[PDB]
């Protein structure tokens, strides 16, 4: 009748007592691991501890922020040559066509000289020849 410390959905959950009559006690809020956040329109992670001592599947999750990707239960900076411009479930993406190699932890790859990205387009957009 005790649920253990857990990492789940890029959130840390504390040790909790099992068999509590109060939903404030048996269900606990997880705290995001480093460089993970709850998206603007997302549910904050919460997990229920059952009477038998086993965690249920959590509701909600944290997501790795821009420039980071989930590796196991951690958020790790994108490798050079990769990028990630938003907090999302997605891995880092390889730089698109006509960009220059990015540093570690980048949110975009810079256009090759003579190429451009329109401001309306996302960072995943490949760069196009300047007319």
């Amino acid at each position, epitope marked *: 009748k005790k649920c253990p410390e857990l990492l789940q959905g890029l959130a840390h959950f504390p040790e909790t007592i099992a068999g509590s009559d109060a939903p404030s006690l048996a269900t606990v809020a997880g705290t995001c691991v480093d460089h993970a956040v709850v998206p603007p329109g997302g549910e904050e992670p919460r997990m229920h501890c059952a009477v038998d001592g086993e965690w249920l599947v959590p509701i909600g999750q944290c997501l790795c922020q821009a420039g980071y990707e989930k590796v196991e239960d951690a958020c790790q900076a994108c*490798s*050079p*040559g990769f990028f990630k411009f938003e907090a999302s479930e*997605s*891995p880092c*993406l*390889e*730089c*698109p*066509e*006509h*960009t*220059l*190699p990015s540093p570690e932890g980048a949110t975009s*790859c810079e256009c*090759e000289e003579g190429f451009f990205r329109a401001p309306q387009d996302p960072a*995943s957009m*490949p760069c196009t020849l300047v007319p």
Partner: antibody
Amino acid sequence: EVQLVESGGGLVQPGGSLRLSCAASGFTIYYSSMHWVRQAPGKGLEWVASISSYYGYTYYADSVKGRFTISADTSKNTAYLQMNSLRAEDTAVYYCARYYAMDYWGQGTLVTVFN
Amino acid sequence: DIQMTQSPSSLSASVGDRVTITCRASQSVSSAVAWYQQKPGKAPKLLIYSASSLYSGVPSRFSGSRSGTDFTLTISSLQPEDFATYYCQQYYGYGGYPITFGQGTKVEIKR
């Protein structure tokens, strides 16, 4: 662990066709770029073709344009190289590999054009 | 195609030696350069990417550097497992342009 398993190589007459497969596990192929690189016996490495289903492009070495077609089925997590109008110069071990800086490689499959 | 001119085509060395392999790009390729090792009967193995980033699991005796269009792979202390062929590669533009490889450098045992 990431793994790329190739198949489909073998013996083909000139003008014939083969289809190579590159089955990926341990990652989602849609989020990667995949590449075919070939090595003729006793020679170096030569890029053949690239694909990104994420960006929606295919690119080809001049030497194979108009003859080979690179494709993928993301629902099978597999990449393909359709090789038509084969030539003696195409004989090589064909590798599939992940990303422009190719971090994982298939085990290779030998393509032998024979008369 | 941007050419990668790799030198030397071969070299003989002893275990413990410092070894340098150099590749000159025919025009600027930014830092879009990788280095690979290959042994007979095996697929190539990525050592260095983005000109100087060490790939995970590759020992720190391997390093890469860039000066303009010149790229060098240095092995600070050659190990028995390092006798192999080495290739540079450029991927400038990440698809904008043909990917090309150096012609390779065979690192052999001196005796």
